[PDB]
Design a protein around this ligand. Sequence first.
Ligand SMILES: *[C@@H]1O[C@H](CO)[C@@H](O[C@@H]2O[C@H](CO)[C@@H](O[C@@H]3O[C@H](CO)[C@@H](O)[C@H](O[C@H]4O[C@H](CO)[C@@H](O)[C@H](O)[C@@H]4O)[C@@H]3O)[C@H](O)[C@H]2NC(C)=O)[C@H](O)[C@H]1NC(C)=O
Ligand SMILES: *[C@@H]1O[C@H](CO)[C@@H](O[C@@H]2O[C@H](CO)[C@@H](O[C@@H]3O[C@H](CO)[C@@H](O)[C@H](O)[C@@H]3O)[C@H](O)[C@H]2NC(C)=O)[C@H](O)[C@H]1NC(C)=O
Ligand SMILES: *[C@@H]1O[C@H](CO)[C@@H](O[C@@H]2O[C@H](CO)[C@@H](O)[C@H](O)[C@H]2NC(C)=O)[C@H](O)[C@H]1NC(C)=O
Ligand SMILES: *[C@@H]1O[C@H](CO)[C@@H](O[C@@H]2O[C@H](CO)[C@@H](O)[C@H](O)[C@H]2NC(C)=O)[C@H](O)[C@H]1NC(C)=O
Ligand SMILES: *[C@@H]1O[C@H](CO)[C@@H](O[C@@H]2O[C@H](CO)[C@@H](O)[C@H](O)[C@H]2NC(C)=O)[C@H](O)[C@H]1NC(C)=O
Ligand SMILES: *[C@@H]1O[C@H](CO)[C@@H](O[C@@H]2O[C@H](CO)[C@@H](O)[C@H](O)[C@H]2NC(C)=O)[C@H](O)[C@H]1NC(C)=O
Ligand SMILES: *[C@@H]1O[C@H](CO)[C@@H](O[C@@H]2O[C@H](CO)[C@@H](O)[C@H](O)[C@H]2NC(C)=O)[C@H](O)[C@H]1NC(C)=O
Ligand SMILES: *[C@@H]1O[C@H](CO)[C@@H](O[C@@H]2O[C@H](CO)[C@@H](O)[C@H](O)[C@H]2NC(C)=O)[C@H](O)[C@H]1NC(C)=O
Ligand SMILES: *[C@@H]1O[C@H](CO)[C@@H](O[C@@H]2O[C@H](CO)[C@@H](O)[C@H](O)[C@H]2NC(C)=O)[C@H](O)[C@H]1NC(C)=O
Ligand SMILES: *[C@@H]1O[C@H](CO)[C@@H](O[C@@H]2O[C@H](CO)[C@@H](O)[C@H](O)[C@H]2NC(C)=O)[C@H](O)[C@H]1NC(C)=O
Ligand SMILES: *[C@@H]1O[C@H](CO)[C@@H](O[C@@H]2O[C@H](CO)[C@@H](O)[C@H](O)[C@H]2NC(C)=O)[C@H](O)[C@H]1NC(C)=O
Ligand SMILES: *[C@@H]1O[C@H](CO)[C@@H](O[C@@H]2O[C@H](CO)[C@@H](O)[C@H](O)[C@H]2NC(C)=O)[C@H](O)[C@H]1NC(C)=O
Ligand SMILES: *[C@@H]1O[C@H](CO)[C@@H](O[C@@H]2O[C@H](CO)[C@@H](O)[C@H](O)[C@H]2NC(C)=O)[C@H](O)[C@H]1NC(C)=O
Ligand SMILES: *[C@@H]1O[C@H](CO)[C@@H](O)[C@H](O)[C@H]1NC(C)=O
Ligand SMILES: *[C@@H]1O[C@H](CO)[C@@H](O)[C@H](O)[C@H]1NC(C)=O
Ligand SMILES: *[C@@H]1O[C@H](CO)[C@@H](O)[C@H](O)[C@H]1NC(C)=O
Ligand SMILES: *[C@@H]1O[C@H](CO)[C@@H](O)[C@H](O)[C@H]1NC(C)=O
Ligand SMILES: *[C@@H]1O[C@H](CO)[C@@H](O)[C@H](O)[C@H]1NC(C)=O
Ligand SMILES: *[C@@H]1O[C@H](CO)[C@@H](O)[C@H](O)[C@H]1NC(C)=O
Ligand SMILES: *[C@@H]1O[C@H](CO)[C@@H](O)[C@H](O)[C@H]1NC(C)=O
Ligand SMILES: *[C@@H]1O[C@H](CO)[C@@H](O)[C@H](O)[C@H]1NC(C)=O
Ligand SMILES: *[C@@H]1O[C@H](CO)[C@@H](O)[C@H](O)[C@H]1NC(C)=O
Ligand SMILES: *[C@@H]1O[C@H](CO)[C@@H](O)[C@H](O)[C@H]1NC(C)=O
Ligand SMILES: *[C@@H]1O[C@H](CO)[C@@H](O)[C@H](O)[C@H]1NC(C)=O
Ligand SMILES: *[C@@H]1O[C@H](CO)[C@@H](O)[C@H](O)[C@H]1NC(C)=O
Ligand SMILES: *[C@@H]1O[C@H](CO)[C@@H](O)[C@H](O)[C@H]1NC(C)=O
Ligand SMILES: *[C@@H]1O[C@H](CO)[C@@H](O)[C@H](O)[C@H]1NC(C)=O
Ligand SMILES: *[C@@H]1O[C@H](CO)[C@@H](O)[C@H](O)[C@H]1NC(C)=O
Ligand SMILES: *[C@@H]1O[C@H](CO)[C@@H](O)[C@H](O)[C@H]1NC(C)=O
Ligand SMILES: *[C@@H]1O[C@H](CO)[C@@H](O)[C@H](O)[C@H]1NC(C)=O
Lengths: 120, 120, 120, 454, 41
Amino acid sequence: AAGSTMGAASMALTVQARLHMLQLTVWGIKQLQARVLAVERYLRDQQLLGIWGCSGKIICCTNVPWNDSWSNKTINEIWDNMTWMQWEKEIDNYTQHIYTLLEVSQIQQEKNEQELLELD
Amino acid sequence: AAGSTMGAASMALTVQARLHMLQLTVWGIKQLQARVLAVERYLRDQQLLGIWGCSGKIICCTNVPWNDSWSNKTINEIWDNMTWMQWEKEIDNYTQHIYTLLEVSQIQQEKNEQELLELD
Amino acid sequence: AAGSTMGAASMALTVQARLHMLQLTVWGIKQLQARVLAVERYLRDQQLLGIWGCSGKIICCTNVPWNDSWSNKTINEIWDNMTWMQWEKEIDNYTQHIYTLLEVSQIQQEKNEQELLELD
Amino acid sequence: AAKKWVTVYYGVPVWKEATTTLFCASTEVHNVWATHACVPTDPNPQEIVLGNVTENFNMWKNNMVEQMHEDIISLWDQSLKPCVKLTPLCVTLNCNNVNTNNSDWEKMETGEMKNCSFNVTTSIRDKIKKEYALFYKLDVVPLTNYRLINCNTSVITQACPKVSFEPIPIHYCAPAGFAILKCNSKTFNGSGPCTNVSTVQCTHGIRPVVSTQLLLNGSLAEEEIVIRSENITDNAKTIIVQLNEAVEINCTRPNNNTRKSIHIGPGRAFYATGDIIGNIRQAHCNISKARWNETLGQIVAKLEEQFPNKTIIFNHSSGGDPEIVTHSFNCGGEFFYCNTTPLFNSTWNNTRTDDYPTGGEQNITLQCRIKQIINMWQGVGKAMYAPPIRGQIRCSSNITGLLLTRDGGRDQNGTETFRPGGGNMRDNWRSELYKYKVVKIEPLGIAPTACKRR
Amino acid sequence: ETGEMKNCSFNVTTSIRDKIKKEYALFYKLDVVPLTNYRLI
Ligand SMILES: *[C@@H]1O[C@H](CO)[C@@H](O[C@@H]2O[C@H](CO)[C@@H](O[C@@H]3O[C@H](CO)[C@@H](O)[C@H](O[C@H]4O[C@H](CO)[C@@H](O)[C@H](O)[C@@H]4O)[C@@H]3O)[C@H](O)[C@H]2NC(C)=O)[C@H](O)[C@H]1NC(C)=O
Ligand SMILES: *[C@@H]1O[C@H](CO)[C@@H](O[C@@H]2O[C@H](CO)[C@@H](O[C@@H]3O[C@H](CO)[C@@H](O)[C@H](O)[C@@H]3O)[C@H](O)[C@H]2NC(C)=O)[C@H](O)[C@H]1NC(C)=O
Ligand SMILES: *[C@@H]1O[C@H](CO)[C@@H](O[C@@H]2O[C@H](CO)[C@@H](O)[C@H](O)[C@H]2NC(C)=O)[C@H](O)[C@H]1NC(C)=O
Ligand SMILES: *[C@@H]1O[C@H](CO)[C@@H](O[C@@H]2O[C@H](CO)[C@@H](O)[C@H](O)[C@H]2NC(C)=O)[C@H](O)[C@H]1NC(C)=O
Ligand SMILES: *[C@@H]1O[C@H](CO)[C@@H](O[C@@H]2O[C@H](CO)[C@@H](O)[C@H](O)[C@H]2NC(C)=O)[C@H](O)[C@H]1NC(C)=O
Ligand SMILES: *[C@@H]1O[C@H](CO)[C@@H](O[C@@H]2O[C@H](CO)[C@@H](O)[C@H](O)[C@H]2NC(C)=O)[C@H](O)[C@H]1NC(C)=O
Ligand SMILES: *[C@@H]1O[C@H](CO)[C@@H](O[C@@H]2O[C@H](CO)[C@@H](O)[C@H](O)[C@H]2NC(C)=O)[C@H](O)[C@H]1NC(C)=O
Ligand SMILES: *[C@@H]1O[C@H](CO)[C@@H](O[C@@H]2O[C@H](CO)[C@@H](O)[C@H](O)[C@H]2NC(C)=O)[C@H](O)[C@H]1NC(C)=O
Ligand SMILES: *[C@@H]1O[C@H](CO)[C@@H](O[C@@H]2O[C@H](CO)[C@@H](O)[C@H](O)[C@H]2NC(C)=O)[C@H](O)[C@H]1NC(C)=O
Ligand SMILES: *[C@@H]1O[C@H](CO)[C@@H](O[C@@H]2O[C@H](CO)[C@@H](O)[C@H](O)[C@H]2NC(C)=O)[C@H](O)[C@H]1NC(C)=O
Ligand SMILES: *[C@@H]1O[C@H](CO)[C@@H](O[C@@H]2O[C@H](CO)[C@@H](O)[C@H](O)[C@H]2NC(C)=O)[C@H](O)[C@H]1NC(C)=O
Ligand SMILES: *[C@@H]1O[C@H](CO)[C@@H](O[C@@H]2O[C@H](CO)[C@@H](O)[C@H](O)[C@H]2NC(C)=O)[C@H](O)[C@H]1NC(C)=O
Ligand SMILES: *[C@@H]1O[C@H](CO)[C@@H](O[C@@H]2O[C@H](CO)[C@@H](O)[C@H](O)[C@H]2NC(C)=O)[C@H](O)[C@H]1NC(C)=O
Ligand SMILES: *[C@@H]1O[C@H](CO)[C@@H](O)[C@H](O)[C@H]1NC(C)=O
Ligand SMILES: *[C@@H]1O[C@H](CO)[C@@H](O)[C@H](O)[C@H]1NC(C)=O
Ligand SMILES: *[C@@H]1O[C@H](CO)[C@@H](O)[C@H](O)[C@H]1NC(C)=O
Ligand SMILES: *[C@@H]1O[C@H](CO)[C@@H](O)[C@H](O)[C@H]1NC(C)=O
Ligand SMILES: *[C@@H]1O[C@H](CO)[C@@H](O)[C@H](O)[C@H]1NC(C)=O
Ligand SMILES: *[C@@H]1O[C@H](CO)[C@@H](O)[C@H](O)[C@H]1NC(C)=O
Ligand SMILES: *[C@@H]1O[C@H](CO)[C@@H](O)[C@H](O)[C@H]1NC(C)=O
Ligand SMILES: *[C@@H]1O[C@H](CO)[C@@H](O)[C@H](O)[C@H]1NC(C)=O
Ligand SMILES: *[C@@H]1O[C@H](CO)[C@@H](O)[C@H](O)[C@H]1NC(C)=O
Ligand SMILES: *[C@@H]1O[C@H](CO)[C@@H](O)[C@H](O)[C@H]1NC(C)=O
Ligand SMILES: *[C@@H]1O[C@H](CO)[C@@H](O)[C@H](O)[C@H]1NC(C)=O
Ligand SMILES: *[C@@H]1O[C@H](CO)[C@@H](O)[C@H](O)[C@H]1NC(C)=O
Ligand SMILES: *[C@@H]1O[C@H](CO)[C@@H](O)[C@H](O)[C@H]1NC(C)=O
Ligand SMILES: *[C@@H]1O[C@H](CO)[C@@H](O)[C@H](O)[C@H]1NC(C)=O
Ligand SMILES: *[C@@H]1O[C@H](CO)[C@@H](O)[C@H](O)[C@H]1NC(C)=O
Ligand SMILES: *[C@@H]1O[C@H](CO)[C@@H](O)[C@H](O)[C@H]1NC(C)=O
Ligand SMILES: *[C@@H]1O[C@H](CO)[C@@H](O)[C@H](O)[C@H]1NC(C)=O
């Protein structure tokens, strides 16, 4: 119910997953831009997931605590009883803080500590 | 012998792995299209493997049974004693059925069940 | 200290991580090339890491021994007491040898042996 | 009992408003609007219905309309680029009239179709030949000596005589990573909140129809006539009336007009009107009187609610250049300009139409003129010369809506006056794209969890 | 100024191809050369 809990309105689904010569014509140039852009957007998300160690995940679990200054609501107030769009707005100002925390130490230290453990 | 079992004729190998200013000239436009297309084809395969949880794999093992309606031949009739091209033709009509099964539940449930197990 | 050990001068950091209509104008064509190229370079590195089984790694550990013909210096002579640029020059002639070894057997055999182990 | 942890979800159903470049999707006629460069559409373009969501749409602030406007202009141009520029025809024209007196009422010509001779350099640069062509009155101006209208100050390019202008539906498609939301509410009216929202990768096809006063071959209202405006009170805004039923309009140019080919340069052939075989007649359009009467009865009821008690007055255009103050459409390359005075003929009480006397008349006639030198978008793009297309031209179309404006709205007598006005062609496309919004998808999101990574 | 800014007349085809009009313009000395008849440099 992971995709059903965060509001009934989760129905945007994955239209983004659903998604001749290159003639530089009035419509052709626009078609080129559309293809180049689709690639760029895909990679920006994939690279960020790669950085956090979430490259192969749909849902990834991390070692960074929730903090609670971003939002002090609980699991049944945030995860349940809420729609994803509302949620992203509620913590929009912490996007960079959180992304920074998801990489810093969380991937960087985790990997350096493993490097040391793997020497044994 | 994984690359030798499925017919002697496995010698296409990986030519696809082997693979100045952008002037929009008669040859230049074609060169651009070739580069854009190579990227698009690469990503279509990589994204699908990512979806199935096979992103880092050469050969990935799954939790979805063979079904046997697609083909009722056995391992030594399909895996051995057969060439890959013949095989892809033999089960061509099940491509979407199989791809759907490789994602649905197989990645989706596997990850949601792990989310629950990781709460302990 | 993995990013500090290999010379004090490790400060190039990751500027590469930091990184409207497509009109084909004098500046516009150059902008297109810049975007296409950024994608191509990103993918060339990501694909190679994928091949070696290092797709989700910052630092990946392998099963291929150092050999010592490439360089017979020790860990505290190479890893420490050296700058990364000097190091890449010191073993530049072994780049293809090493890359070949990182894939051949190391990923290929490791995965085929796992295929056999996973049959139990 | 547990700590909350930060977890990342990918495939999160959220979005933000965004404007991007759209691409199009869809016989060797080189159609200019729907070129071979269009990708084919999806035979099964499954629509995704959203759940309890709301969204804010505004057809008057819709960048899809603006993007389409630029695309239509770019497609018009470019397609006309590799063609004959007709500069050599800008010479003195020695013109006279023709004899139209060969009982064809409502079809008679009166002093138009001038017979002009001219001195044009032939394909060989040191040789000049006298040539003849017939011109529509609206294509020439006097200096009797005449010149082609708009020769001074502009370049009139002849369309390549193989290229079709027939509108073919064009679908707009979002790039992957983007989606188009549409409002399906019966109560939408082109603005504000919408609760019935669904999304597509591509829009329905839109015919790139160009017209004035009457909107042709667009979509019909699902059930009832809808009057849309940015502002009802502001008389300066265009009021778009979308019909729920089409009204047929049948247009004829009943002449055997045979063309002539004139060489004015090295591979540069001018296609002249040549001459007429048989009795020359003016073009005309017919509509069904009964349908017009029903249509207007329903429109007045709707305008009366917006403007209660007051007399409804329909009137003709305010007057001006018969390029923009008349009805306009294109059938096979022939450009028609028609007098719509008879359609916006009168005024009435309540919601009861009147002053259209009962009689044997079944077909309301509109007198039309033909122009070969035209200016789509007036000053944007280039003037174009339409080749003649060999005679007996007939076409018909669906009136799907009207563009109305208010005539000042300063009448102190308890009346309101509407005219078949309107602005830039953006109004036509706005009337079809009114239900769509472009958004970007942001699939990566953040939420608290109770899990922790090993 | 000393002998520059020449007043030149010329016969130029108008927007209508069979009509020629006499026009006037002033030119900087450095923009013209003699052949008094001059041509644009
Ligand atoms: C609103 O929609 C209607 C249709 O629903 C549309 O009317 C159609 O217009 C097209 C314009 O091309 C007509 O097609 C022509 O039909 C005649 C019939 O004999 C043909 O001769 C024409 O041939 C031309 O193109 C050929 C291409 O090779 C040339 O070889 C030839 O020499 C001609 O140039 C052409 O097929 C179509 O028949 C009508 N439909 C009806 C039912 O009359 C109308 O125009 C749309 N409204 C607006 C405002 O666009
Ligand atoms: C467009 O509208 C005009 C105007 O009504 C139509 O012209 C009309 O056509 C009818 C039918 O032919 C004429 O009525 C009768 O025709 C018979 C034919 O023999 C004649 O014998 C009768 O005496 C009578 O004339 C009608 O008079 C005529 N109107 C005019 C002004 O002449 C036209 O046909 C319509 N068609 C199209 C394609 O738009
Ligand atoms: C326009 O004028 C031209 C010439 O003034 C007409 O063409 C003439 O038609 C007669 C008919 O017998 C011929 O005998 C002449 O030799 C033609 N002249 C030329 C130069 O070809 C043309 O028909 C006129 N068009 C109209 C509608 O009156
Ligand atoms: C086309 O050229 C002819 C001459 O080749 C022009 O006819 C002459 O016009 C002059 C004007 O004064 C008369 O004096 C001559 O007597 C005319 N010659 C003839 C044979 O009639 C003709 O007017 C030019 N046509 C146009 C439209 O410029
Ligand atoms: C609310 O939205 C749904 C989906 O947009 C509408 O469902 C349509 O219902 C008509 C009725 O015949 C069908 O023909 C359409 O095919 C349905 N749409 C789809 C995408 O299947 C529903 O009618 C809307 N409700 C209101 C009041 O407009
Ligand atoms: C088109 O729809 C909009 C949105 O419902 C109407 O605007 C509303 O008008 C009422 C009139 O009192 C206001 O109270 C609302 O606050 C307006 N809504 C918004 C979002 O501003 C608009 O009037 C409608 N057009 C017509 C012709 O009825
Ligand atoms: C103009 O309106 C008429 C009907 O008033 C349209 O004719 C219908 O077209 C559909 C297209 O599939 C047919 O299925 C119907 O059977 C037709 N109706 C009749 C009564 O035959 C006509 O297509 C409309 N033209 C345009 C351009 O939309
Ligand atoms: C719709 O247009 C009307 C007409 O301009 C606007 O109402 C006017 O608002 C100005 C504001 O200073 C007043 O001075 C005028 O007296 C108002 N006119 C009338 C007739 O009351 C109206 O505000 C516009 N609506 C929106 C939403 O902008
Ligand atoms: C425009 O032409 C169409 C046909 O070309 C006319 O439609 C016909 O109307 C008659 C009236 O009884 C029907 O019996 C026919 O079946 C209709 N034909 C088709 C194809 O539907 C239409 O009425 C004309 N409209 C005008 C205003 O003249
Ligand atoms: C339709 O528009 C015409 C044109 O404006 C109106 O006729 C004008 O009426 C005023 C009234 O004083 C006269 O001063 C003008 O001189 C008239 N114009 C012309 C050209 O005669 C006409 O009255 C309008 N229709 C209705 C019902 O009001
Ligand atoms: C449209 O047609 C009407 C007539 O159907 C033209 O108006 C007529 O102009 C003559 C000129 O003397 C008057 O005598 C008539 O009384 C006018 N009739 C009406 C109803 O006003 C009108 O000018 C034409 N308009 C265009 C744009 O061509
Ligand atoms: C616009 O109004 C005029 C009258 O003001 C209508 O003219 C009448 O049309 C009928 C149709 O056959 C004729 O029998 C009458 O003799 C006409 N009257 C006059 C004074 O000429 C005209 O038809 C109206 N337009 C429409 C579409 O009905
Ligand atoms: C009104 O217009 C319609 C359509 O133009 C006329 O219908 C014509 O009817 C005759 C009857 O034999 C047919 O032969 C024609 O082919 C029909 N026309 C078309 C275009 O198909 C109708 O007669 C007109 N009515 C009046 C009273 O004039
Ligand atoms: C969240 O992290 C910031 C980082 O400085 C810290 O200052 C803040 O106190 C933390 N919030 C809570 C509620 O612990
Ligand atoms: C979060 O802290 C704010 C501080 O004022 C408080 O008002 C709000 O009610 C708190 N929310 C929860 C869920 O405790
Ligand atoms: C959601 O939060 C609201 C806040 O008023 C509360 O009334 C409602 O009962 C909650 N719903 C659930 C399912 O807990
Ligand atoms: C901070 O987040 C809250 C969440 O509702 C939002 O309302 C507020 O506007 C945000 N502030 C900034 C500066 O983004
Ligand atoms: C294969 O899967 C389909 C899914 O409906 C099932 O109906 C079919 O019976 C399965 N085939 C076999 C041989 O079990
Ligand atoms: C598979 O089933 C079909 C059904 O007719 C049968 O003919 C075929 O021999 C079977 N193949 C095997 C390998 O059992
Ligand atoms: C492959 O299948 C054919 C079927 O006739 C059989 O004759 C042959 O012996 C098989 N080969 C092996 C290696 O089993
Ligand atoms: C189904 O698969 C068999 C395998 O040989 C193939 O021959 C047949 O043509 C396929 N049918 C369709 C509709 O693809
Ligand atoms: C390094 O690998 C090569 C591969 O042929 C081998 O010949 C060489 O002896 C190895 N070097 C050392 C020092 O073992
Ligand atoms: C590596 O081998 C070379 C061979 O001459 C030798 O000169 C060099 O000193 C050796 N380096 C180390 C670190 O032993
Ligand atoms: C680095 O190598 C040089 C070689 O001369 C040596 O003198 C120096 O002490 C070494 N530094 C460290 C930190 O071992
Ligand atoms: C081999 O590596 C050494 C390392 O210093 C370098 O100096 C030498 O030029 C390289 N030779 C070639 C052929 O690359
Ligand atoms: C809309 O909200 C109601 C509240 O009960 C819910 O039952 C319904 O399922 C929601 N809509 C969708 C599409 O789920
Ligand atoms: C073009 O020529 C016509 C001829 O009368 C003239 O009326 C018009 O004003 C001219 N255009 C300009 C901009 O002068
Ligand atoms: C038009 O003229 C051509 C000349 O051949 C003739 O064949 C055709 O039938 C004529 N059409 C009409 C309507 O008279
Ligand atoms: C409609 O007719 C009534 C008859 O009493 C009259 O009072 C009213 O003013 C008229 N309305 C219009 C719009 O002329
Ligand atoms: C228009 O429709 C109304 C509806 O009652 C009718 O009374 C009136 O006579 C009609 N007028 C014409 C001209 O058909």
